Amino acid sequence: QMRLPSADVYRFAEPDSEENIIFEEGIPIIKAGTVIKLIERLTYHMYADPNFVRTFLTTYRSFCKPQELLSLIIERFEIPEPEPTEADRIAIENGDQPLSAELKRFRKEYIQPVQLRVLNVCRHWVEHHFYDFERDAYLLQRMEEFIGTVRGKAMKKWVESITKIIQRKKIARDTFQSSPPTVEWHISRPGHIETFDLLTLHPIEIARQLTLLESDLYRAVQPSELVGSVWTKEDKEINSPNLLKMIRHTTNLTLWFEKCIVETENLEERVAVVSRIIEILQVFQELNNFNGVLEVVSAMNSSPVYRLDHTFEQIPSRQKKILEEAHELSEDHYKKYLAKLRSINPPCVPFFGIYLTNILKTEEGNPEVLKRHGKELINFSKRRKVAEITGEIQQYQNQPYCLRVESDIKRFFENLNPMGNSMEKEFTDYLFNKSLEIEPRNPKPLPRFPKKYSYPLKSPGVRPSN
Numbered sequence: 025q026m027r028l029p030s031a032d033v034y035r036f037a038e039p040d041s042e043e044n045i046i047f048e049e050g051i052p053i054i055k056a057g058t059v060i061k062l063i064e065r066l067t068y069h070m071y072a073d074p075n076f077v078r079t080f081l082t083t084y085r086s087f088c089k090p091q092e093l094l095s096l097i098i099e100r101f102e103i104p105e106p107e108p109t110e111a112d113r114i115a116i117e118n119g120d121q122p123l124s125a126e127l128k129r130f131r132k133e134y135i136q137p138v139q140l141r142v143l144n145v146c147r148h149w150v151e152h153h154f155y156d157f158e159r160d161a162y163l164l165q166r167m168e169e170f171i172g173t174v175r176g177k178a179m180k181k182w183v184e185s186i187t188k189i190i191q192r193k194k195i196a197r198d199t200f201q202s203s204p205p206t207v208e209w210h211i212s213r214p215g216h217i218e219t220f221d222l223l224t225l226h227p228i229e230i231a232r233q234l235t236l237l238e239s240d241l242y243r244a245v246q247p248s249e250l251v252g253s254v255w256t257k258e259d260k261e262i263n264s265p266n267l268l269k270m271i272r273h274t275t276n277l278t279l280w281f282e283k284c285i286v287e288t289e290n291l292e293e294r295v296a297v298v299s300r301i302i303e304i305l306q307v308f309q310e311l312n313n314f315n316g317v318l319e320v321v322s323a324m325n326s327s328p329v330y331r332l333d334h335t336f337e338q339i340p341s342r343q344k345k346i347l348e349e350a351h352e353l354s355e356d357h358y359k360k361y362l363a364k365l366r367s368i369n370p371p372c373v374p375f376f377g378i379y380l381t382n383i384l385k386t387e388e389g390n391p392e393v394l395k396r397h398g399k400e401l402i403n404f405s406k407r408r409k410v411a412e413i414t415g416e417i418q419q420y421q422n423q424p425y426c427l428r429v430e431s432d433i434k435r436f437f438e439n440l441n442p443m444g445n446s447m448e449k450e451f452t453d454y455l456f457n458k459s460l461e462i463e464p465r466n467p468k469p470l471p472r473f474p475k476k477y478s479y480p481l482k483s484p485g486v487r488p489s490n
């Protein structure tokens with residue numbers, strides 16, 4: 025204990041107690057602690073702790089700023105050495121070499137291990153969370169000065185290693201196993217972008233290109249974008265850019281499906297529209313794009329659409345069953361969805377919405393801090409829980425599809441803007457009022473509306489042309 029530095033010269037060597045660090049229930053699992061005690065354990069002298077390092081660096085922004093973290097780990101690194109013993113003081117003032125038995129042991133067993141673990145944190149930080157340094161150039165400048173002024177022979181390996189990663193990540197900012205299938209076309213010709221629409225593009229190719237787009241959006245989301253509900257906080261655009269792209273696509277696609285349905289006023293044409301969206305669902309199913317399946321389900325369950333009982337009546341029984349089964353994936357807390365996801369073979373796109381729901385429940389169901397003996401301790405178990413949910417996301421992020429990109433169709437779906445200049449709440453009110461117009465509530469009769477589509481409504485089907 026007293027081999028470690030005193031509190032007046034070093035902040036990371038206070039003894040553990042119930043009022044600064046708590047454990048759960050082998051390396052021990054940290055339940056809670058002060059940021060200082062978290063940093064101490066993040067760079068503990070007795071052993072490496074890769075699980076804690078990973079979980080810490082994913083979740084630390086919910087209790088500590090990047091700049092503050094960098095200051096703390098540098099402070100941890102700057103360990104003062106103990107004074108020479110009385111015999112060695114006498115040796116030094118006589119011009120001789122001191123024994124320095126404890127000093128040498130302390131360097132070997134405490135200073136050197138801790139410093140190596142600070143550099144390990146730096147390496148993991150730049151490798152797996154380089155976006156911190158991209159968003160804050162001053163933070164990177166601080167890291168490079170720190171790493172550049174480290175001195176040592178054991179240390180230089182780690183320095184070069186860390187510098188190696190920093191350069192790859194800067195250079196990044198400046199495939200296909202088999203042959204993919206033929207790109208399917210229906211009414212719209214290749215290049216004639218002005219005619220691209222729900223019924224004119226081939227439903228297979230709609231599902232394929234949306235799956236490519238959604239796969240890409242799924243794979244770009246970093247775990248830290250979900251932590252501490254930061255995508256709902258005021259800094260959402262900087263902290264959760266990829267997450268917000270995913271959410272906005274889902275909103276635009278879902279609301280586009282609804283718009284296509286309710287703005288098709290002719291009953292028989294609207295049946296064709298609903299039927300084509302179910303075919304797009306079928307192809308999402310074939311591709312294991314569960315995100316896409318549940319986007320269609322979401323549109324079909326929306327207030328404006330779900331009430332359109334005259335439309336659904338004409339949908340063939342086989343398509344009815346496909347849509348009904350898709351809904352049932354969501355019943356009993358996504359029981360059948362989860363059973364489906366663990367059974368299928370790659371590639372897939374998981375339903376992203378369920379992670380957000382479960383993370384929000386975890387964030388709202390657990391406190392930010394714990395209290396022991398009148399002192400606040402950061403609730404790290406809360407963060408680990410959230411990190412475990414983000415871990416589930418990550419395990420499906422390296423599943424590329426063997427499908428050819430079609431740049432014009434991709435762009436059409438990237439540029440979907442069903443709301444126009446309207447806000448969402450007012451737009452869904454408009455969709456609902458449209459639904460009341462096309463199929464009035466039960467006492468009123470059902471009026472007829474003229475056709476809007478000049479081209480054939482017959483679907484080309486969902487079986488691919490080899």
Ligand SMILES: CNCc1ccccc1-c1csc([C@@H](C)Nc2nc(C)nc3cc(OC)c(OC)cc23)c1
Pocket residue numbers: 298321324325329330331332333335336347348349351352
């Ligand atoms: C009654 N409206 C039927 C309807 C008209 C227009 C277009 C689509 C459809 C359509 C037919 S089945 C369906 C799917 C997506 N949804 C559902 N499926 C099943 C089996 N059960 C549900 C049970 C629900 O609450 C108890 C529910 O609440 C939203 C949705 C369910 C949607």
